[PDB]
Design a protein around this nucleic acid. Sequence first.
RNA 1: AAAA
Lengths: 600, 592
Amino acid sequence: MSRVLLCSAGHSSMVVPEAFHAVPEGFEEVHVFTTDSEKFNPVVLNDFFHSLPNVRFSITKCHGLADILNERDFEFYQEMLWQWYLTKMPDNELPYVCLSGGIKSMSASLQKAATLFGAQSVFHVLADNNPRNIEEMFDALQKGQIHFIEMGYEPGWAALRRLKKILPINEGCSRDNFKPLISKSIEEILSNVKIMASDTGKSNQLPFPSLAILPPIAQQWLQLPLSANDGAWIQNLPKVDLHCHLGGFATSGSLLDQVRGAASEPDLIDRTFSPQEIAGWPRSHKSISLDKYMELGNANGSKLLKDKGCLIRQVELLYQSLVNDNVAYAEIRCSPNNYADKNKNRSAWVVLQDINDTFTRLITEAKQKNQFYCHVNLLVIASRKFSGDLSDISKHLALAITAMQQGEGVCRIVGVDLAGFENKETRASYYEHDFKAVHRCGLAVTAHAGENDDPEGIWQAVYSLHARRLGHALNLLEAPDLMRTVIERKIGVEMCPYANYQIKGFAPMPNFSALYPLKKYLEAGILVSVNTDNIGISGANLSENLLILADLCPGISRMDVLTIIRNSIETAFISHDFRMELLKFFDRKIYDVCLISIKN
Amino acid sequence: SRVLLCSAGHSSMVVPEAFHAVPEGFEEVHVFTTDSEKFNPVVLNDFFHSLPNVRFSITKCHGLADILNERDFEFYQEMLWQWYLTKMPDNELPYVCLSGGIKSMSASLQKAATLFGAQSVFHVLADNNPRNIEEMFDALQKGQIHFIEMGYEPGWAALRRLKKILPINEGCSRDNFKPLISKSIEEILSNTGKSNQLPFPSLAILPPIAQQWLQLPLSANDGAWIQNLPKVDLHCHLGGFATSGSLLDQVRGAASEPDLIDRTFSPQEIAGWPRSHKSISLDKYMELGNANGSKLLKDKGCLIRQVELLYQSLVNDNVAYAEIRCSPNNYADKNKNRSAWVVLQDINDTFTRLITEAKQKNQFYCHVNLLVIASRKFSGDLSDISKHLALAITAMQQGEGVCRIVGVDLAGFENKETRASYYEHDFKAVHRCGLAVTAHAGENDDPEGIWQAVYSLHARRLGHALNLLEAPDLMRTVIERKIGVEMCPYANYQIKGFAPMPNFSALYPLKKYLEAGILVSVNTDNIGISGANLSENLLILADLCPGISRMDVLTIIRNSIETAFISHDFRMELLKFFDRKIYDVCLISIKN
RNA sequence: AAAA
Ligand SMILES: Nc1ncnc2c1ncn2[C@@H]1O[C@H](COP(=O)(O)OP(=O)(O)OP(=O)(O)O)[C@@H](O)[C@H]1O
Ligand SMILES: Nc1ncnc2c1ncn2[C@@H]1O[C@H](COP(=O)(O)OP(=O)(O)OP(=O)(O)O)[C@@H](O)[C@H]1O
Ligand SMILES: Nc1ncnc2c1ncn2[C@@H]1O[C@H](COP(=O)(O)OP(=O)(O)OP(=O)(O)O)[C@@H](O)[C@H]1O
Ligand SMILES: Nc1ncnc2c1ncn2[C@@H]1O[C@H](COP(=O)(O)OP(=O)(O)OP(=O)(O)O)[C@@H](O)[C@H]1O
Ligand SMILES: [Mg+2]
Ligand SMILES: [Mg+2]
């Protein structure tokens, strides 16, 4: 807690100590703006506050203006004062303001600034002597001559105070190229209120993260369709990834080599599989069969992560890639049974516990140093095998159910994945009774609909399995009833632009004329979420997946990207309170990044 | 308007120099000052006499001088606010300058201007500080006197009804003071998911004072605000509206055959109704509605009159969307060849005709959709559920119409045989046909029944269901699956009994449900039986659930919108209209 | 406590 005290004196320097001793409770620091006029005496303030080293103090000098004469001088001074105020809030709390010194215009400007950005209390100091000595204020306050007038209490706009990140890179705002950016901010607020009032039709609604305060130029830029040039804005955007397999993250290249390196014992590590030739990845120009695409990732996965060191390195690298992409929430699909090995007492449960422990350690160590971190949950993928061993699905479900009971931990199991061969041999109809247990235990269910997904199959998945999220399902608009049901039941679809681009084949690949249905789904209201599926085999992260929508779905707007992020948040398997916290954080970060992108 | 506003001090220059702030002449200027003898009005009066058109008004703050004391400052601030509101121009915002006066008075005037609106806040300055009016003429001729204006201010639209609630009070002292606005200002931050749950994103454009007032707890005195709100009703039985009073008389008098109408029997009255101080069983609750219903609505004319009166009451309550539950078989007789289908068609046609007529006249209209009630064990054999399900499925195919059947409702009386887990067999067709399922899983129902209705019957909404707090697993299942609960505060308060009704200590779980995240909605059940429309049903929350905020009421309305059985395309435009209306009413209801 |  720090009670920053703000004041400003014309030439009479007695006001600042008067304000300091107005409240005998004491404060933490005082910051005062003053002109560069020679009539002002900072030596008195320096020597008076030097007696209290425990309280910080500073003086900011407005160069180039001894006094306010014309409109230009006052405007530039107001810009400078707004900037200095912006650099001097408490990190979380509000400051205090006094208006006993200075000219009328500058005091009114300071009060306007306090109203705009908010303050704990706005007051003045009054005395019946107006003295000039310093060894008399103590006698005046002992007798009671000092009078303080408290009138102000104001929250301001949180969004209008969120722009403390716009000020720097301004070389001191010299006269030759001065930029009144806080003047642009006040034009922003005035314009927002004026379009809100004088207009009714165009000023109705549209913001999905409830921003509604960005400058109107920012809103117009958001409405315009994005291009491949918006990669800088997309990269800074806090994104959500919901479909990201753990075993298909580092399948080739330097990441694969360095995950092979820290693999505990390197004796059992062998150089198997190979990348695919003529495939101009990640922007392939030919369809790839699902089996061949899966085999492309065989370099890393079930046969490689069987040792603890390799698995730990893989998950650490995945978390590093996620945080490097500004992904603020992720849900990693992992198959613990694949990496289980009873030979070394490495069951599926201990593999899942290792993944959970390393993710929690990474998130906690990132939170301790106060840096960007990716809160990641896990999905126990209950894949279909049916090479015998029908108990495999039951074991996966039981492990997923019993893994929730950890209770604590920043990383936790949230749901299961119904992947596998989506053929009619393993439709969702048979498992209406297996999944009563998984539903009663609070787990969520996500399903795969990559191929041979008849609308009856998806109906069974969303009505018998009660899947709250679907995978791919690129042919929803073929069946209008299925699309209507998905719309009404508010279930989301995990659509991966690169995986669907390569596996199924969409425009502008030659000999393929099918259009990507992401834009049509968004218009229909489908809670679509752009994901990665496999960072390794697909070869691209979430930023590139969002960028490619400029080509797969022409005319897609940036506001639609914000809609996609909001839908990913809404369809995520998280509790209500955590969802609201995530929504607040995403709103704040979206506001900041939009302001930065529009200004630069 | 064209009104200037300024403060006075030692020098009288301030008003003459501010007079020519506009470059094309001004209309009328007013001055506020204290009782200090230093100020002379003679110079300003003489200077204004040269221009007889301008209205000169001088107001002296009685009994105050130099504003040196805390109480003196508070007195001056209160009188300044009263004078500012009394001198508030009717339509156009006024200009204001604050160069003169003490820093304290200047700050108070700036706060007043930024709180009640201002056409512009500006300043006057002169390098040489002139004294003789000849020096002002010289200054305007050779142009040193600049005009300093930090930027045009919007001001907050609604703070002017205070000038109506307070009289002139020419004679005043320290006895009279109104902390009406300072009470909301003090509690601005003096009081986690509140801000995150902010619905209707245009609420961010609201004034910070208005936003703070929105965060304040609900009170019984803001019925005027709660009435002007556009609300959504999702649980409103058609046959429980015109039960007693003039409504019953005018719905009976419009019957085609008044001879067969029984005008003798009337429902009993309970003291304190609708805020009954004693609990009542559900059977007697339905008994109150015996005046209307099946035995009355058989006649076509009276049924049409009932529908028209219900729509008129919905519009009068400023409800912008409703989902009326009707049981066509209850009002269908074969004596005059009146099947259930023709009854449903008559209700639908009356509703769509009313909506179209109101829309073509560009008035406020309530969009109405119908729910077909599939009652259990009412008329004997249980083929009625199948007949009603088929009726709903066929009636949803009509296509054309602003009013359409959107789903079915399942009705259970108390418990056990009235459980929502016996008829799971019929509902595959109704799910696949595009309809939505709602269950009356209320009035002390066990968690297993609600769970079965949620999962086996795929119900999208649950009626009442006040016992979710005792089943945390069920509560989590409801929360994560985004299944709304429609609770009627008045019906539950009258039947179940909660605080502050005497002899009962249980408290309504409305606030707890809102905090948990359940998409809870507030409805009317039966307007006639409960004797309470949606406005007062929402208002009674401030009494049943203390600490509920107005922003929580807005969240309740948003939840009602979200859980409605509407298409996404219609939902988007409904949300847009609701956001605009909410912003408009909030911007013109902080006025009190 | 720079046109108190
Ligand atoms: N698109 C998919 N469709 C069906 N099942 C999938 C899909 N992606 C992953 N899986 C499941 O995850 C595993 C994929 O292959 P594998 O068993 O070898 O482990 P992995 O590490 O996750 O991937 P990889 O094959 O690259 O090693 C299988 O269990 C598979 O059922
Ligand atoms: N990667 C993240 N970085 C920062 N905050 C996050 C992140 N992910 C989630 N959050 C949320 O932000 C808050 C973390 O910081 P904290 O709890 O101290 O509140 P805060 O500091 O006011 O918010 P912020 O960190 O955004 O400034 C939590 O509400 C958390 O849910
Ligand atoms: N609280 C309730 N519980 C169960 N069923 C209800 C409830 N309220 C209304 N109903 C249903 O409405 C009908 C009850 O009465 P009725 O059939 O005579 O016509 P009504 O207009 O809906 O109400 P009433 O005539 O009793 O005033 C039944 O279909 C019943 O299932
Ligand atoms: N009671 C209502 N009053 C006004 N508009 C409503 C009402 N209910 C719904 N609306 C919405 O207003 C629009 C109805 O009028 P219409 O479809 O012709 O467009 P509009 O005239 O441009 O909008 P508005 O009626 O608000 O001026 C729809 O978007 C509708 O969802
Ligand atoms: Mg996948
Ligand atoms: Mg009911």
